[PDB]
Amino acid sequence: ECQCGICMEILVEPVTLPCNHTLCKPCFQSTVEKASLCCPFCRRRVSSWTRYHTRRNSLVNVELWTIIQKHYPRECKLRASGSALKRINKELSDLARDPPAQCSAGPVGDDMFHWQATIMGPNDSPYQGGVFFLTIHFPTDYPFKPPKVAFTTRIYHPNINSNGSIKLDILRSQWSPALTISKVLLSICSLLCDPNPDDPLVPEIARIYKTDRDKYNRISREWTQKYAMGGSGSGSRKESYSIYVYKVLKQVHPDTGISSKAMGIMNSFVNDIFERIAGEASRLAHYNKRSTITSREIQTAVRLLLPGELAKHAVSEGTKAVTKYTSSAKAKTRSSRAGLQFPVGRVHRLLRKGNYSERVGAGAPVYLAAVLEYLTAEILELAGNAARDNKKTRIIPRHLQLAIRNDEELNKLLGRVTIA
Ligand SMILES: [Zn+2]
Ligand SMILES: [Zn+2]
């Protein structure tokens, strides 16, 4: 609990500066002794203090060091043996440990430096009942530089403008590494309950808030209604498509099996293709200020990321799936309605879960599921062919690597994925 405000790892050889900020010795030497010679929290000069004590081996607060060592030895010894990414990874764990009320945030797909966040309109405030989405961008120098935070949902606030920019001291001048994204999100919640009209970002809204509060409250609720009516993230657990890879392998090679080690690689392929297409689809949606990812954003992602004929075929399979899905009967399952083996409803959840956008249309998961199915069928067809070469009836990792390397286009697509 008595943690280092920089790295969020248990204080080892804590160093307490004259300003009485404390940071573990590793953080101190890297950020104060090696270059800055200033406190990373309040920026007070500690040059004279650092040189006087480094010569006498008296940087560590012995009293503080002995207490945490006896009380919490396991974490001191675990730690004993980049910084931005790890700090961001520790933030996500902190968010899961003490989830901030009315708030949630998580990375966009597998990109840790780009998060999505939701803020429920605080209770008894004119934004109550609305869900407000925000975009968070962690800089290279995190936590030494602030995170870029902005609203993507329009809101009526004296300190929030049409760009989604948030005028809030801790986001810039008063930012400190000791702050966490959870603390930042809770400060935004307070700002919604108690605007700061005397330091406005939108003077008109501040003047109305200062001279006609009834008006301000009315317009805030109308805006909350018109525009405001985002989770842990993708998580660390690896999804699997074994059920559906098996189904496709049966269609393509009914007399050929696939080993357990090979199936894990197939999952890796499918998960990698999902992440890349959805990630690009997320970029396009944000680029064009669209709240919903649809079949259009998925297609353009496939057109750009897939090579040559794979892209053309995948685009065809995705277009035919959506077309068949729109004309199908409403009663059957979504996968059945699109004529696919891969799970449409499940792909939609994973698209929603990955924080790729505020909303996800019904055509997107159909188009993406059909693309995943097609690419899976191509890999399995070639992998099965590769196995038949070696006089084998069961696909193994070696046959998967062969099929990818022997196909120019698939090698371009999956060559970077590691096969053991
Ligand atoms: Zn530290
Ligand atoms: Zn300080």
Side-chain angles (χ1 to χ4, degrees), residues 1-206 208-387 389 392-420:
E1 69 296 10
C2 53
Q3 267 302 343
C4 176
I6 302 271
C7 65
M8 299 181 97
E9 316 256 356
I10 209 53
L11 295 156
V12 278
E13 289 180 293
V15 173
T16 307
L17 312 158
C19 51
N20 292 284
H21 279 128
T22 286
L23 71 179
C24 69
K25 200 166 150 125
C27 277
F28 162 86
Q29 313 225 77
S30 93
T31 203
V32 179
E33 204 186 60
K34 268 198 171 187
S36 310
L37 282 165
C38 296
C39 179
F41 301 99
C42 61
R43 298 169 272 300
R44 299 250 297 267
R45 273 206 82 175
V46 307
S47 174
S48 34
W49 180 93
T50 300
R51 319 273 200 61
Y52 173 71
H53 285 273
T54 314
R55 175 176 188 249
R56 301 151 182 68
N57 161 23
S58 60
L59 304 183
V60 185
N61 175 335
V62 58
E63 323 149 305
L64 184 61
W65 184 207
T66 80
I67 289 179
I68 66 183
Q69 222 173 345
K70 181 183 178 181
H71 264 281
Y72 284 94
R74 172 49 171 164
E75 37 272 68
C76 290
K77 84 200 304 306
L78 190 268
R79 164 157 204 196
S81 69
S83 39
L85 192 76
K86 186 22 168 203
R87 164 65 189 244
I88 293 150
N89 280 307
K90 275 277 173 256
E91 291 254 16
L92 203 53
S93 322
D94 167 51
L95 276 158
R97 209 207 309 203
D98 321 81
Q102 309 263 306
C103 295
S104 61
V108 174
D110 292 10
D111 181 351
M112 296 321 282
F113 288 88
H114 182 190
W115 286 23
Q116 191 187 247
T118 45
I119 284 196
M120 305 199 255
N123 282 334
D124 309 321
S125 97
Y127 316 109
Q128 173 162 45
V131 169
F132 298 87
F133 289 84
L134 304 90
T135 197
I136 296 157
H137 270 96
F138 292 90
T140 37
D141 256 322
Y142 199 77
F144 301 115
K145 276 307 164 254
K148 257 270 156 209
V149 189
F151 277 82
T152 71
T153 302
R154 274 316 287 118
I155 185 169
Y156 194 77
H157 201 285
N159 312 116
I160 317 181
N161 61 24
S162 59
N163 298 319
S165 286
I166 304 159
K167 176 144 199 181
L168 181 60
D169 43 62
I170 51 154
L171 285 176
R172 278 163 197 83
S173 78
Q174 290 318 309
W175 167 257
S176 175
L179 295 176
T180 66
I181 191 78
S182 162
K183 283 180 208 295
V184 174
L185 287 169
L186 293 173
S187 297
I188 297 178
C189 282
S190 297
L191 184 63
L192 300 194
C193 296
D194 300 293
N196 303 321
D198 287 341
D199 192 349
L201 191 59
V202 189
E204 236 186 58
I205 300 173
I208 286 152
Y209 179 97
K210 260 152 72 215
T211 73
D212 193 355
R213 188 74 61 75
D214 264 22
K215 185 145 168 211
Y216 164 81
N217 281 359
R218 185 204 88 216
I219 313 199
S220 282
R221 317 231 186 211
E222 293 172 354
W223 277 47
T224 291
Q225 186 48 204
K226 177 174 190 103
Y227 295 118
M229 317 293 234
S232 307
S234 75
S236 55
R237 65 166 143 288
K238 181 184 181 179
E239 302 281 340
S240 161
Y241 296 80
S242 179
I243 287 148
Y244 320 96
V245 171
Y246 276 136
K247 280 162 186 300
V248 173
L249 180 51
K250 197 71 196 166
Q251 282 172 336
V252 179
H253 286 297
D255 293 344
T256 309
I258 184 170
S259 83
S260 191
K261 264 171 164 39
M263 185 62 88
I265 304 176
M266 291 303 297
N267 285 332
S268 277
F269 292 149
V270 172
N271 291 331
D272 181 75
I273 288 155
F274 186 109
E275 217 296 319
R276 288 196 269 160
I277 287 167
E280 179 64 10
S282 179
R283 209 190 51 68
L284 299 182
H286 283 295
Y287 179 81
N288 290 299
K289 323 243 168 288
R290 307 131 166 196
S291 322
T292 306
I293 280 171
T294 73
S295 61
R296 179 233 290 250
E297 282 76 33
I298 300 285
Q299 169 150 303
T300 299
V302 180
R303 200 74 87 162
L304 184 74
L305 307 182
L306 265 64
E309 301 301 312
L310 283 175
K312 277 143 162 196
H313 285 75
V315 162
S316 192
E317 291 284 3
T319 306
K320 302 215 146 263
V322 175
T323 295
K324 185 187 199 82
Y325 180 84
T326 60
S327 298
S328 57
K330 325 304 170 299
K332 257 287 205 155
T333 80
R334 289 151 88 178
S335 295
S336 195
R337 289 169 55 191
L340 308 173
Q341 310 283 305
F342 267 52
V344 168
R346 190 212 173 182
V347 163
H348 195 144
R349 170 159 52 82
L350 301 174
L351 284 177
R352 282 185 298 236
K353 167 183 212 52
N355 295 334
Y356 297 109
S357 62
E358 306 171 25
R359 305 282 136 188
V360 172
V366 168
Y367 199 116
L368 182 55
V371 167
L372 293 171
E373 198 184 310
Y374 162 66
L375 296 166
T376 290
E378 261 284 288
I379 300 165
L380 287 166
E381 190 181 326
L382 300 183
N385 286 347
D389 305 348
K392 302 273 174 298
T393 67
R394 186 176 218 61
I395 290 156
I396 54 169
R398 186 201 137 61
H399 305 159
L400 288 170
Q401 174 120 57
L402 253 174
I404 304 306
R405 291 289 316 291
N406 282 355
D407 195 65
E408 184 149 300
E409 291 203 342
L410 263 200
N411 182 65
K412 290 182 199 290
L413 187 83
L414 305 168
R416 266 176 151 81
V417 171
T418 36
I419 297 162

